[PDB]
Amino acid sequence: ATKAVCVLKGDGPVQGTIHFEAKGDTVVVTGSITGLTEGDHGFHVHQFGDNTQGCTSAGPHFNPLSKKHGGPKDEERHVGDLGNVTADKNGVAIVDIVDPLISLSGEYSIIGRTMVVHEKPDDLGRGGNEESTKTGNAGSRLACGVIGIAK
Amino acid sequence: ATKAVCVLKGDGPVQGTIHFEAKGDTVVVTGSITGLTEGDHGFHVHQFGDNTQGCTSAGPHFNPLSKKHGGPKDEERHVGDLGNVTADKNGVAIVDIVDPLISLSGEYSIIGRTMVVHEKPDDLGRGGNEESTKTGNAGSRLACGVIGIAK
Ligand SMILES: [Cu+2]
Ligand SMILES: [Cu+2]
Ligand SMILES: [Zn+2]
Ligand SMILES: [Zn+2]
């Protein structure tokens, strides 16, 4: 596909729409998320597009290269590690990311997988406990959605 | 992808979980839908995995081969025409379909697209009218979901 979309929903007030578009050899991620607490929130692609148990059945971070968690700019990162989105005073976060690891086709395709917005900030694999190395201490999954092909 | 899952949701009471498994050159579709009126309901793969406007933004039946609407056993059918599912007196439909056109990979892949359960029976292209050859006269979209990768 050259375009994908994801509608995020959860059990609280957090909702949003994220669009993905292949522009050249990279993927541009845009959109906005509302209902969040002010500050940074971990924003990642989880492996399974399985919503049978809410966001929980999405599994861990998409990680075909079997690396540890990190920031979007690190070499050692999961493919699904997109960093943090930042909510303003009003709970609105605007998404504007360009990423070199995800794709809309092939082995790194994220179509069919789940976008998750987390409760806390992602520490980028630098928190110093085992958990940092897995999820960045980003905490619970506030909203998520399966990434589908768009028009 | 060898397994997929879809969780169907809408604005009324219809809900369900559909599972997909690649077996030889076919896809085996299983699962259950509840909250349906007794009888037949059309069950099709729609083109886009776009839920921004409910089931409406899913677009038309998935039809990469530009054919007219038919039943699953017809040569002239859309790739997304899986026929009808049947709800019992209690409103429960058990899904058990084996289909050779839909796929979980390649060009006819349905991952990232939308599974839709309709209000009325699909006439399989034999309704005599023009709508019959587009949608089977299945009526409105009761519940739908994006097809994601499962474990
Ligand atoms: Cu995460
Ligand atoms: Cu349909
Ligand atoms: Zn990660
Ligand atoms: Zn059709």
Curated annotation (Swiss-Prot), chains A, B:
Q: How is the cofactor bound?
A: Binds 1 copper ion per subunit. Binds 1 zinc ion per subunit.
- Phosphoserine found at: 103, 105
Mark the residues carrying the PTM N6-acetyllysine: 120, 134
Catalyzed reactions per annotation: 2 superoxide + 2 H(+) = H2O2 + O2
Residues bearing the modification N-acetylalanine: 1
N6-succinyllysine carried by residues? 3, 9, 89, 120, 134
A molecular-function term among this protein's GO annotations:
protein-folding chaperone binding
Cofactor(s) the record lists? Cu cation; Zn(2+)
S-palmitoyl cysteine lipid sites: 6
UniProt-annotated location(s): Cytoplasm; Nucleus
* Binding-site residues, Cu cation: 44, 46, 61, 118
Entry's EC annotation: 1.15.1.1
* Family the UniProt entry places it in: Belongs to the Cu-Zn superoxide dismutase family.
Protein's recorded name: Superoxide dismutase [Cu-Zn]
Source organism of this protein record: Bos taurus (Bovine)
